[PDB]
Amino acid sequence: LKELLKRAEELAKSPDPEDLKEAVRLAEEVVRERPGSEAAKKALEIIQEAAELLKKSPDPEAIIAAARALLKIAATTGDNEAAKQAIEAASKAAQLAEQRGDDELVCEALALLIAAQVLLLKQQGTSDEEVAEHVARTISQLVQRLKRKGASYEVIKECVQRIVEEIVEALKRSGTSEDEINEIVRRVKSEVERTL
Numbered sequence: 033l034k035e036l037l038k039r040a041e042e043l044a045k046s047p048d049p050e051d052l053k054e055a056v057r058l059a060e061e062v063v064r065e066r067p068g069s070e071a072a073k074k075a076l077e078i079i080q081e082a083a084e085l086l087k088k089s090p091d092p093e094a095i096i097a098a099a100r101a102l103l104k105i106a107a108t109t110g111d112n113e114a115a116k117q118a119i120e121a122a123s124k125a126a127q128l129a130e131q132r133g134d135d136e137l138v139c140e141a142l143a144l145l146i147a148a149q150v151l152l153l154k155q156q157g158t159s160d161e162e163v164a165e166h167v168a169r170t171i172s173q174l175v176q177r178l179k180r181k182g183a184s185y186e187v188i189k190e191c192v193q194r195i196v197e198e199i200v201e202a203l204k205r206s207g208t209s210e211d212e213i214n215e216i217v218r219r220v221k222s223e224v225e226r227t228l
């Protein structure tokens with residue numbers, strides 16, 4: 033346990049994305065094994081440290097790993113700054129993926145971006161009706177744009193599935209009850225159906 037924690041702290045000092053991704057995995061393991069311990073709190077500090085270096089990489093896959101880790105911290109702790117950092121990283125990744133016309137990679141980044149947006153909206157007190165409207169408009173606009181662009185059916189389906197999955201996961205990790213999540217998804221589905 034403490035061994036995993038020490039090695040994660042070491043790997044988090046290396047700007048190499050392979051070392052940083054491993055640092056995140058080791059620390060996230062500590063969190064999963066000792067959820068509310070002091071080692072878990074130490075692990076979250078290491079994850080945030082490693083993620084801030086990963087986000088500075090020029091590689092979209094590395095930046096996405098940073099956004100995913102920052103989003104997990106945000107949901108786990110209710111840290112608004114963590115959520116804003118996840119948005120920053122996901123946005124950077126989305127633009128680099130767009131640059132190379134990789135819609136699949138764009139959607140990976142957007143799913144994390146939208147999930148972080150939902151988290152912040154909830155942390156700031158926005159209503160579930162407004163959250164659902166934000167998500168529905170974003171999905172509807174994205175689906176229509178990818179259709180115009182020529183993205184395949186499976187790419188678009190995966191895009192939407194990933195967005196919804198990341199939102200649900202982030203809301204669950206942040207303590208949102210399953211009753212509230214289901215109601216939010218219901219609203220989103222109703223609006224997307226009308227639009228689409």
Ligand SMILES: [Ca+2]
Binds near residue numbers: 201
């Ligand atoms: Ca996840």
